[PDB]
Symmetry: C2
Subunit: 198 residues, 2 copies
């Protein structure tokens, strides 16, 4: 067993320490966040920080890193979409994180395709098999490191046919959702089992 | 494609809605949180909400659901361990979530084994292959649904030999870390690829 002390971790070069600490949370979700400004200019960003907050009411949280437009659009319009990345699109999803021209939509820049549904004024990713609209409820600034904790209410959900079981469970491996580890590693899930209420 | 509206989701029975909304974040990390009270009584809980907050300083966040002892111990002593669940121990990890006697340690109650390291006064899970000590920095109460957002600084990390690559990356599949989806589904990761800075 190897031991990395607090001092040893601080000694590491910035990028090495980044890969290392970002690996420590365990698996993370891979989601595309669809937004637009008030003039209808769209944006799309991959994030790995979507976190469940509750089912009643249905609340989802995410942490925004210390592009600017995704957070700015959310703050200005209060609307966004969350779209599962899947194995067919994880390369294009990853590409959204590149730095683009100020007015360059990551939808336009990549092979991903926007989609508007149910009068919701933020674009969905057409290629995503599980996605939902979200309305901003609260944002909390974390001064400890400059992150933003964005809290929103789930509105509408769209999911491939046959994916949602009668008890509400969705098999993420069956719809080919991908997971992330570290800053840049993508994985599919291989189901072990569902375990009953302990 | 199926569409579940806000109204449809609210119509679902509590447990069905729970499975459904908890599936929507995508994959989640599976971590055991080791704690003890001021008298040395230990506790252990599985959580699926550990989230990366930053690498400099190294901060990890977690959301505690709306057992009491894990949060109480953290608040009273300011110390806890975060331990990756792996394929060999996910059944026992799941069992920690059962309701136990007031003074019954989940270490004692399950096949998992406590371990103290480097003078840190919170127990580690011996069987975990990636684990770290954490010191409480901040806790924020979320009144929107009664959750607690617990923020701590990573102190010491312990990891199986050969797991940490020279660039800091840790292959979670190689150390057999497990992921969670929904409320009760466990998975291993099957690596697709690491992608370069876009
Ligand atoms: Ca050593
Ligand atoms: Ca496109
Ligand atoms: Ca329909
Ligand atoms: Ca035991």
């Amino acid at each position: 067993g190897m031991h990395f002390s607090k001092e040893h971790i601080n000694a590491l070069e910035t990028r090495t320490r980044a890969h290392f600490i970002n690996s420590l949370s365990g698996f993370k979700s891979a989601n595309l966040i669809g937004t637009q400004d008030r003039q209808g200019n769209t944006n799309l960003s991959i994030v790995s920080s979507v976190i469940h907050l509750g089912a009643n009411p249905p609340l989802m949280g995410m942490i925004i890193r210390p592009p600017r437009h995704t957070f700015e659009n959310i703050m200005q319009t209060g609307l966004y979409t969350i779209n599962h990345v899947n194995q067919s699109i994880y390369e294009q999803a990853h590409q959204t994180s590149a730095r683009y021209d100020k007015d360059e939509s990551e939808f336009e820049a990549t092979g991903l395709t926007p989609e508007y549904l149910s009068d919701f004024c933020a674009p969905f990713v057409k290629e995503s098999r599980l996605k939902y609209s979200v309305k901003l409820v609260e944002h909390q600034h974390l001064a400890i490191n400059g992150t933003e904790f964005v809290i929103g209410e789930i509105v509408d959900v769209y999911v491939d046919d046959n994916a949602v079981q009668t008890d509400g469970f969705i098999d993420l491996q069956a719809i080919d959702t991908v997971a992330i580890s570290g800053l840049d590693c993508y994985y599919t899930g291989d189901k072990l089992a569902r375990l009953p209420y302990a």
